[PDB]
Amino acid sequence: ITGTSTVGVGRGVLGDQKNINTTYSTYYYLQDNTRGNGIFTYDAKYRTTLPGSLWADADNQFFASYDAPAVDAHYYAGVTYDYYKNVHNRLSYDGNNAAIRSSVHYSQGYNNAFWNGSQMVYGDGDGQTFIPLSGGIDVVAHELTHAVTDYTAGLIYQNESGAINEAISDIFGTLVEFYANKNPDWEIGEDVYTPGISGDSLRSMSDPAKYGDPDHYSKRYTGTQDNGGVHINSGIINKAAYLISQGGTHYGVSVVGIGRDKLGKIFYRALTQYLTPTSNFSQLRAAAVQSATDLYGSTSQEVASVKQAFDAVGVK
Ligand SMILES: O=C(O)C[C@H](NC(=O)OCc1ccccc1)C(=O)O
Ligand SMILES: [Ca+2]
Ligand SMILES: [Ca+2]
Ligand SMILES: [Ca+2]
Ligand SMILES: [Ca+2]
Ligand SMILES: [Zn+2]
Fold it and tell me: What is the spatial distance between Cα 275 and Cα 17, in angstroms, rounded to a whole number?
């Protein structure tokens, strides 16, 4: 809606206090006018009708436990916006500053989050497997990254192209986690996953096999569950991306790490200029090699590391 830009203060899902950009018009709304065409956060009110109600608050203060997921979805959307803009010169997910919309309190005990083709959507979780999912910055950025991929490479959500889709969201979710620099790591979902158990997560890029996910092509899943294993075989690519950045020896293949920034650069370029909707793992390797070549030259260390990492995970 129309109104004045203001600044609220609230607490996130993990009890942390933070400032949020709000909009004032009778009520204080979760509308950030500082970023692109705006970031809008809605209340789905435990139902599944979307988007639900633009979040309205009487006093620009967001400390109620009910507020917390909206606080983080709003804040973390802004962080992710900043990453793509400051790091990749990308303006929102479509490159033209499209409004970013998120709904929270979707359904009841909903242990999931997603991009619905138009907006982000976060369950509260059931309190056992998940607490409210927007509490995880790598979750928020994974989801918004799905929007980026949809507008760019458009990787179809199935089989190897689908697993590439997932890895890209896991890669950029992690890189955004590092960008904000609060407890960053190469795990996925640790901040909102299983509040009863410390140290675990939904998936691991550093060691996919920690959670039953393949870390080598020879161990790929070939059946039909999970749209041909898009959340499973992503481990192969997650591990490759981990290797490219951090380095290491994997199945006896040594990889010289080149760090986060360049991993980001190579993959962002791969995603936006070389991947197509039907790209398989093998074409992803080629896309990444050509991206590293464009950026650093065909005889560079960067190129040699991309090749070593994909060799390491068994992708030719
Ligand atoms: O299948 C979909 O499109 C929805 C699925 N959602 C999902 O896995 O929710 C939990 C979660 C999300 C991001 C990071 C860690 C955990 C996805 O985004 O892949
Ligand atoms: Ca309030
Ligand atoms: Ca973390
Ligand atoms: Ca993480
Ligand atoms: Ca846990
Ligand atoms: Zn995903």
Answer: 40
